[PDB]
Structure formats: structure tokens, C-alpha cells
Paper text:
However, the only member of the CX3CR subfamily, CX3CR1, recognizes its sole endogenous ligand CX3CL1 to play essential roles in the cross-talk between monocytes and endothelial cells in the periphery as well as microglia and neurons in the central nervous system. CX3CR1 primarily couples to Gi upon activation, subsequently mediating multiple signaling pathways, causing cell migration, angiogenesis, and apoptosis resistance. CX3CR1 participates in numerous physiological processes and is involved in many important human diseases, such as atherosclerosis, rheumatoid arthritis, neurodegenerative diseases, and cancer, making it an attractive therapeutic target. To reveal the molecular details of ligand recognition and receptor activation for CX3CR1, we solved two cryo-EM structures of CX3CR1-Gi1 complexes in the ligand-free and CX3CL1-bound states, respectively.
Residue numbers in the entry:
A (entry chain D): 12 to 340
B (entry chain C): 6 to 55, 182 to 233, 241 to 354
C (entry chain R): 23 to 310
D (entry chain E): 9 to 61
């Protein structure tokens, strides 16, 4: 294990000062109030994933009832109703251009639907087939390129026009559960069921860096707004922030009171406030810098499975298994 | 406000469509198929009318059933088995002639224990199917079964071996009040198997109706 | 045979006041329990909510009776029509919704596959509206020809109708109370008991036992009212030989009303000790 | 083992990438957070006049 010691020595050599010590000078944010501005109703099954829109008004959510509907957050109503061939959906994505929507699940195929591009109707555009495992996550790289993570330990990048895999990332060891897209649209990081979360390169298609530290399977991951860092949500009741430059867990977010795992992790517009959707019927709100609790979100009856933050930070949408979506702030 | 009114009425109509679709889905019966290495015993029926998950639809006694096989899912079970919460019953298939083959019976019992004691299917019942009975008839004669269980202490006949296997599988429940395990032996004809499935589904529906009230 | 009224008006008014308090508290607790969480409500839950609403109608119409008893002010014919309408529509809604609960349990237990296959079973809201409309329609003749005469509002029927209208009304209400609903509930619960014993679910069929106990309590506490209604029907049909009935009928009606209001107040008290989750909800509510 | 040999080359790329001090990365993250702090409706509450929720 000569290479194992070399990377460990480099991390120790680059370790100079922890984030907690540096954040002593800055003023803690303190406790802040979370209130449900509005609630989205109509789902009849557990909600597993949702994605915010670039327009900051339209959001799409996935539920186990076989419907992938799009919510209008401003006026609190639904705009589209997309039936799903397979009712087992565990992930969904919304195109940045807003003309496309994706959804994965246990069907091992990622479906693409036209969001009323023509004729004022919704129809299936492309069905990305070629994954031997359940689609744990999927994200639209571009209007034509989409990167998805499956249950077969491998992540693949798909092109809508060709319908095939432009590149495939097989460097993982455990079952991949979620992925996030960097703001520059050039890198993406995915967490797996093992203890290692590794960054991926879109153009290179190879594992540039690998991050360890978690004691259990990682369920959620999200890039920091700057794009040089990201946070991982595992089942060990610990949220760890990883920096693409330091190559170490510069900040850990674990509280003794909350021993439950983490299902969804999302960052605010500035990134100072980090929201993690726990499965104790609540969604704890943390601070990226102070590494302490900043708010309590206990407006859900069932375990929170998905959590999304608007691009401009206008509102935060939290989904849970109670088939209810609530918009915060 | 014509655009707002049009959006509101479209939202209401699609909401009512979603509600009626959800009601229609609730009118159906959802069943989960499980097994270490045994599958296809229930899917080989002629009543069926309709990739990691295979959905099979068959109507028996004017009741619609939906089966979901998970054999193609080779990933971690705990990461996706929660999506199957709410199914009426779970069909578990065990081969009676798996004790001699390799440890296979031990793996099947371990899988059954993991599924039953997973704190996610406590309310849902489990339907147990014991297949390969015809081959087991000669397997129990050829294989004394004493090697599989050092403390078996029973007759080397098909009936006693089947009873011991059923008792061992039932002993892994540890939750008798919340759920009830229905054990059946696969027959040559599929009519008996489908009748047992229908009876177990009806019993589960009756049990759910007993607790449907949110005030009693 | 001979009966003498020895019920103090002040004590009876205090009894109605405490019945009002108990019934209001119980109905509020029941309605809150059936609308506490955001999860979808079962059809039996909305049926119990409708029953609680009928009990609320009873506790809202008894203040008029108290006003007659002690206040003796504002006793107009319109207000008598109002209170009689509320009381009878509440009684008819209660009996009809109990029958609907019995039928729903019969479908859920005996014809479970058929009940699940049918789509109208889940549509309990339209069933509730239909039941309320039927109860209102069947109670409409019960109060639309009443007026006040000598500090007691009853009768005042047209001369042509008075020959047959009161006896027809009495026999119709007695029938719609304890003839068709009684047989329907008895058959439904008999089938449910047979199915539970055959399928060996009796050890966990606590809800069925609770509903059966509630139905039995309702029937036992509403039996005297229908018995005296039948006696009145026989008296109008000159089939009753005894003459003291014409004097004791007022006391019989009063005591039947008292026992009916007692049943109304204790209807949701049964859900407390017999309902484990209702008792658990009360502990959670008392904490706030 | 073919898999073991392939994994050796994968670890070489991860070990050979440039790594900077964790303090500098933390300082950069904090600076970015303060830079966009005034533009974060979650961190800084927004009046209901400009709030569309
Ligand atoms: C003299 C009469 C006509 C006036 C008063 C009638 C009142 C007590 C009755 C008539 C119809 C009833 C409604 C009919 C159906 C529903 C839907 C159900 O899910 C909840 C109760 C609700 C909302 C009922 C509440 C009480 C109700 C409004
Ligand atoms: C004569 C006595 C025993 C009758 C008591 C029960 C009555 C009130 C109940 C039993 C079943 C009920 C019906 C069941 C089904 C529906 C379909 C629905 O879409 C409208 C209402 C309607 C038509 C209900 C109206 C009232 C109803 C007929
Ligand atoms: C229309 C006619 C034919 C209906 C006849 C009603 C009879 C058969 C039904 C109505 C309610 C039923 C009872 C309800 C409760 C129980 C308690 C249970 O532990 C034993 C049976 C027993 C005692 C049932 C026996 C039969 C029963 C009395």
C-alpha cells in the first residue's frame, strides 16, 4: 500500500488549520426561523426526488404513484402531468433550458419528456437504456447531454440525440446513490454506498480525486456554490464538507441529538447556509462555516427524502414520504 | 386575468385526473416477489396479461394483481427496498431441494430473516412458497438431510422434512401480531397457487380494513 | 300503567346543560382527532366525522329545549320548526350513517375483493352528501306542518291531513328507524362476524367490536322512543285499549328525549376507553 | 490480477494532482460566502414586497 501512504501523507502535509479554528473570528449566524410559505398538495405516494428550475418558479417532483408533475411555485398550482411507465422512480432532473425533464428509478432506464415544446402537450422524447442498475440520480449537463448514476456501481453520461453513452465512469466501488453538477458545467461528483466519494471529469472521463472519511453509505451530495467544494450526506448521522483543493474533510457536521442518517443535501445561493434533509421527519439546517445548527425545519410528518434550494435562493422546497411538498421562505 | 384563470382551471383538471388515477391505482393489488435463487414459479401462470424491475399483471376472481420481480436488481437491497413499502403482500420463493446444493437453504433463510426483520415491512405480510416439491420427493430419499441440520432430530421422510422446513421459516418471523406468514407448497397446476395467492390477498385486505379506521 | 311526572324543571335543565357540555367536548375531540394529521382520511373516518356532526346538531338544538324549559322566552313557531328540524335530521343522519358504516364494514370484510374493485367505495364524500340529502328529504315531512299551541309546539296539521298525516308520520319514522336499518345492520354484522370467525381475525378485530358496541348502545338508548312512537301509532289506530296512555305519553316522550340526549353525549365517550389511538391522541392534545 | 493492476494506475492520477493547504481553501470558501452573503435570501431575510413566496 505504498500509494495509500503517499496520498495520506499529502493530506497530512497540506493540513494546516481546521475550518472551526478559522471561523472563530467570523460572527455565528445564530438561530433563524423556518416557516412554510406554501404547501404543494396532490401527490398520493412517497416523494423521492425533486429538482428546482432555472426560472425559479417551476419545480418538478417524482413520486411513487407513477406521476412526474411540475409545480408552479409562484401561483401554487400544477402546470403539467406526466404519467410514468414505471411507477418506481427514485430520481428526477429538470433541464436548465426548461424544455426537458428526466426521471430514473428502479426501471434501469432514464426517460426524457418534452415540456410542451410543440403542440401544447407532453410526450416521451428519449429513453436512455443501457444501465444494469437502478438510476439513483440523474442531472442534465446541457440541453442535449445528461449525466446519470445507476445502481450498478457505474456512472454514465448520455446524449439525447444519439441515445447512447458518450462516456462511462466505472471507478467507483460501492453503489452510487447521488451526484451533483458543478456550476461551471465541467465537473461532477458522485457519492457511493462505500466510504469513498470521488470527483469525476466530464471531458476526461476519469477519477481525478477521491475523498474518504464517512463511516457509512453516502446518500446525498451537492456541490458548493463556488464549485471548488461539496458536502456529502451519509447514514452515519454526519455531513462532511469536502474541498476539491484541500482533498480532505475540512468541516464535519455531526450532532449527537440527531443520530439518524441523511437523505438529501442542498446548499443555499451563497453557500453559507447548508440544508440537509434528514429522515427523522425533519430537515436540519446547518452552517457551512461555523459547522453548527442554524435552523430547525420540522414541518414534515414522514422522513424527508428530497431537498432543493432555488438557484437565486428565493425559496427552499423540501419533499418527504408523506406525499407533500412545502416551500420555505 | 384570463391567463391566470386558464392556468387555475388546467391545474384543477390535471389534479382531478391525478386523483382519479391514484384511486384507480389504489384499487389494484401490489405484490413483491423475492427469492435467493428461485423465481418464475408464480410468473409462469397463464393468467398473466402484461430493465431491473419486471411488472406482471394477472386478474383472478375479478381482482387485479401487480407483481414486481427484483431478481435483476443486484445492488444493495436496503437502498431500494423501501420503495416497495405499501405492497399488500410479499411472495417469497424457496426451493425445497436447496439444502444439499451449495448452503443455498441457509442463504434463503438468511434472506427471509433480513426481509422480515427489516423494520420496513412489519405491517405487510409475507407469502411463503416452497417450490421444487416434486424433485424434493426424491431428494429427501437420496439426501438424508441430517448433514444440513446437525440437530434435525426427525424422520427422513418428505412430510416431516417439509414440516421442519416450514417451522424453521416461521421461527424467523419474531413479529406474529403485526404480520402473518402464509406458507404454501407449489403444485403441478397453477390453479392452486393462484387460489392461495388470492386467499392470502383477501386475508391481508380484511386485516387492513380491520385497522383502516383512524379513531377506533 | 299509571305514571306521574316528578322531574324537577331546574334539575332537568341542569342535566341538559351538563349533557350539552359533555357532548360538545366529546364531539370537538372526535372531530379534531379525525382531522389531526395531513394524511388521507379513511371512509370510516369521514363517516365517524359525520356522526360527530349529527351529535353536534343535537347539542346545538337542545339549547332551544332549555329555552322552553327555563327561559320560556322567544318561543316562536319558526324557532320550534328550526329545533325540531335539527333534532330529526340529526337522528335520521345518525341512523343512516350508522347503516352506511355497517354496509361499508360488510363490504370491506366479506366482499373485500369486490369492495376494493368497486370505485364508489373509496368515493366516500359523494356517499356522505347522498346520505345527508336522503336524511334531510326523509325528515322534511317530520317538521313542515308544526306550530306552537299552549306552550307546547306540536300538531297543527290540516284537517284533511290530520285524519292520516300524524299516524302515517309516526309509522314512517318508526319504520325508517328500527325496521329497515335494524335488519340491514343485523345482517351485515352477522356476515362480518361469520367471516371473522371463519378467517380467524377475531383476535384483532377490535374496530368491528367497537362499532358493534356503538351500534348496540345507540339501539338500546333509542329503543324507548320508537316504542312510544309505536304506542302512539296504535292509539291513533284505536288498537290500544288502555286509557292512561293518553296521559302518560307526554312523560314517555320527555324521558325518551332525555335518554336520547344522554346517548348523544356518551356517543363519543365510548371512543375514549375503547379507542387506543384516540386515548393516545388525547394524551398528546392534553400536553399542548 | 487485472483489476488490481488497473487500480494501481487510477491511484497514481489521484496522488499526482496538485494539492494546496486546507487553510487556504477554507479561507477562499469563507471569502466566497461573505461575498455573496448580502445576495442570499436565506441568510439575509427579504421583505415581503420583493418576496414572491
Ligand atoms: C336544515 C338543513 C338543510 C341545514 C343544515 C344542514 C347541514 C347540517 C348538513 C347538510 C349536508 C351536510 C354536509 C354534507 C357532506 C359533507 C362532506 C363530508 O365529507 C364532511 C361533512 C359535510 C360538509 C356535511 C356537513 C353538514 C351538512 C352541511
Ligand atoms: C332505508 C334506510 C335503511 C337507508 C339507509 C342508508 C342510505 C341512507 C344510504 C346507504 C347507501 C347510500 C348510497 C351509496 C352510494 C351512493 C353513490 C354516490 O355517488 C351518491 C350517493 C349514494 C346513492 C348513497 C346515498 C344514500 C345511501 C342509499
Ligand atoms: C335479517 C335477519 C335474518 C338478521 C339476523 C341477525 C342475527 C343473525 C345476527 C345479528 C348480530 C349477530 C351477533 C353479533 C355479535 C356476536 C358476538 C360473537 O362473539 C358471537 C356471535 C354474535 C352473538 C352474533 C350472532 C348472530 C347475530 C345475532
Amino acid at each position: 500500500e505504498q500509494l495509500k501512504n503517499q496520498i495520506r501523507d499529502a493530506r497530512k502535509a497540506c493540513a494546516d488549520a481546521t475550518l472551526s479554528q478559522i471561523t472563530n473570528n467570523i460572527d455565528p449566524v445564530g438561530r433563524i426561523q423556518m416557516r412554510t410559505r406554501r404547501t404543494l398538495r396532490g401527490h398520493l405516494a412517497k416523494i423521492y426526488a425533486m429538482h428546482w428550475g432555472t426560472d425559479s418558479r417551476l419545480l418538478v417532483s417524482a413520486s411513487q404513484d407513477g406521476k412526474l408533475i411540475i409545480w408552479d411555485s409562484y401561483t401554487t398550482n400544477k402546470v403539467h402531468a406526466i404519467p410514468l411507465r414505471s411507477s418506481w422512480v427514485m430520481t428526477c432532473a429538470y433541464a436548465p433550458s426548461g424544455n426537458y425533464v428526466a426521471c430514473g428509478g428502479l426501471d434501469n432506464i432514464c426517460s426524457i419528456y418534452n415540456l410542451k415544446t410543440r403542440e401544447g402537450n407532453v410526450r416521451v422524447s428519449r429513453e436512455l437504456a443501457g444501465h444494469t442498475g437502478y438510476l439513483s440520480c440523474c442531472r442534465f449537463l446541457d440541453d442535449n447531454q445528461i449525466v446519470t448514476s445507476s445502481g450498478d456501481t457505474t456512472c454514465a453520461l448520455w446524449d439525447i440525440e444519439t441515445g447512447q453513452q458518450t462516456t462511462t465512469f466505472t471507478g467507483h466501488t460501492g453503489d452510487v446513490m447521488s451526484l451533483s453538477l458543478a456550476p461551471d458545467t465541467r465537473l461532477f461528483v458522485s457519492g457511493a454506498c462505500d466510504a469513498s466519494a470521488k470527483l469525476w471529469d466530464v471531458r476526461e472521463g476519469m477519477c481525478r480525486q477521491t475523498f474518504t472519511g464517512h463511516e457509512s453509505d453516502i446518500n446525498a451530495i451537492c456541490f458548493f456554490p463556488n464549485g471548488n467544494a461539496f458536502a456529502t450526506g451519509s447514514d452515519d448521522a454526519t455531513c462532511r464538507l469536502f474541498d476539491l483543493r484541500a482533498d480532505q474533510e475540512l468541516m464535519t457536521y455531526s450532532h449527537d441529538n440527531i443520530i439518524c442518517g441523511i437523505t438529501s443535501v442542498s446548499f443555499s445561493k451563497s453557500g453559507r447556509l447548508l440544508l440537509a434533509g434528514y429522515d427523522d421527519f425533519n430537515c436540519n439546517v446547518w452552517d457551512a462555516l461555523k459547522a453548527d445548527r442554524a435552523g430547525v425545519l420540522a414541518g414534515h410528518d414522514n422522513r424527508v427524502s428530497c431537498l432543493g434550494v432555488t438557484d437565486d435562493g428565493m425559496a427552499v422546497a423540501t419533499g418527504s414520504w408523506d406525499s407533500f411538498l412545502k416551500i420555505w421562505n | 386575468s384570463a391567463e391566470d384563470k386558464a392556468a387555475v382551471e388546467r391545474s384543477k383538471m390535471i389534479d382531478r385526473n391525478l386523483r382519479e388515477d391514484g384511486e384507480k391505482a389504489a384499487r389494484e393489488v401490489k405484490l413483491l416477489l423475492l427469492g435467493a435463487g428461485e423465481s418464475g414459479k408464480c410468473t409462469i401462470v397463464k393468467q398473466m396479461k402484461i430493465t431491473g424491475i419486471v411488472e406482471t399483471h394477472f386478474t383472478f376472481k375479478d381482482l387485479h394483481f401487480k407483481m414486481f420481480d427484483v431478481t435483476a436488481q443486484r445492488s444493495e437491497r436496503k437502498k431500494w427496498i423501501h420503495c416497495f413499502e405499501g405492497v399488500t403482500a410479499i411472495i417469497f420463493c424457496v426451493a425445497l431441494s436447496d439444502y444439499d446444493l451449495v448452503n443455498r437453504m441457509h442463504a434463503s433463510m438468511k434472506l427471509f430473516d433480513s426481509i422480515c426483520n427489516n423494520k420496513w415491512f412489519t405491517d405487510t405480510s409475507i407469502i411463503l412458497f416452497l417450490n421444487k416439491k416434486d424433485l424434493f420427493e426424491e431428494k429427501i430419499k437420496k439426501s438424508p438431510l441430517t448433514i444440513c441440520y446437525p440437530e434435525y432430530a426427525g424422520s427422513n421422510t418428505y412430510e416431516e422434512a417439509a414440516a421442519y422446513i416450514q417451522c424453521q421459516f416461521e421461527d424467523l418471523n419474531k413479529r406474529k401480531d403485526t404480520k402473518e406468514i402464509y406458507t404454501h407448497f407449489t403444485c403441478s397446476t397453477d390453479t392452486k397457487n393462484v387460489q392461495f395467492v388470492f386467499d392470502a390477498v383477501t386475508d391481508v385486505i380484511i386485516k387492513n380494513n380491520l385497522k383502516d379506521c383512524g379513531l377506533f | 300503567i299509571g305514571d306521574i311526572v316528578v322531574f324537577g324543571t331546574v334539575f332537568l335543565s341542569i342535566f341538559y346543560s351538563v349533557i350539552f357540555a359533555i357532548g360538545l367536548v366529546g364531539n370537538l375531540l372526535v372531530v379534531f382527532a379525525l382531522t389531526n394529521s395531513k394524511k388521507p382520511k379513511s371512509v370510516t373516518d369521514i363517516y365517524l366525522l359525520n356522526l360527530a356532526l349529527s351529535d353536534l346538531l343535537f347539542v346545538a338544538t337542545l339549547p332551544f329545549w332549555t329555552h322552553y324549559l327555563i327561559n320560556e322566552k322567544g318561543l316562536h313557531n319558526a324557532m320550534c320548526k328550526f329545533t325540531t328540524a335539527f333534532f330529526f335530521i340529526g337522528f335520521f343522519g345518525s341512523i343512516f350513517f350508522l347503516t352506511v358504516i355497517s354496509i361499508d364494514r360488510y363490504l370491506a370484510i366479506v366482499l373485500a375483493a369486490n369492495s376494493m374493485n368497486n370505485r364508489t367505495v373509496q368515493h366516500g364524500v359523494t356517499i356522505s352528501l347522498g346520505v345527508w340529502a336522503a336524511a334531510i328529504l326523509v325528515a322534511a315531512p317530520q317538521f313542515m306542518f308544526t306550530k306552537q299551541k299552549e306552550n307546547e309546539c306540536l300538531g297543527d296539521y290540516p284537517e284533511v291531513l290530520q285524519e292520516i298525516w300524524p299516524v302515517l308520520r309516526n309509522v314512517e319514522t318508526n319504520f325508517l328507524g328500527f325496521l329497515l336499518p335494524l335488519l340491514i345492520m343485523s345482517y351485515c354484522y352477522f356476515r362480518i362476524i361469520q367471516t371473522l370467525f371463519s378467517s380467524k381475525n377475531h383476535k384483532k378485530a377490535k374496530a368491528i367490536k367497537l362499532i358493534l358496541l356503538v351500534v348496540i348502545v345507540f339501539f338500546l338508548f333509542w329503543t324507548p322512543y320508537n316504542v312510544v312512537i309505536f304506542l302512539e301509532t296504535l292509539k291513533l289506530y284505536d288498537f290500544f285499549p288502555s286509557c292512561d296512555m293518553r296521559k302518560d305519553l307526554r312523560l314517555a316522550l320527555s324521558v325518551t328525549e332525555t335518554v336520547a340526549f344522554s346517548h348523544c353525549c356518551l356517543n363519543p365517550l365510548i371512543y375514549a376507553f375503547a379507542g387506543e389511538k384516540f386515548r393516545r391522541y388525547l394524551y398528546h392534545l392534553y400536553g399542548k | 490480477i487485472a483489476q488490481a493492476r488497473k487500480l494501481v494506475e487510477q491511484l497514481k492520477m489521484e496522488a499526482n494532482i496538485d494539492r494546496i493547504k486546507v487553510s487556504k481553501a477554507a479561507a477562499d470558501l469563507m471569502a466566497y460566502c461573505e461575498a455573496h452573503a448580502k445576495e442570499d435570501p436565506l441568510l439575509t431575510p427579504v421583505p415581503a414586497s420583493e418576496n414572491p413566496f
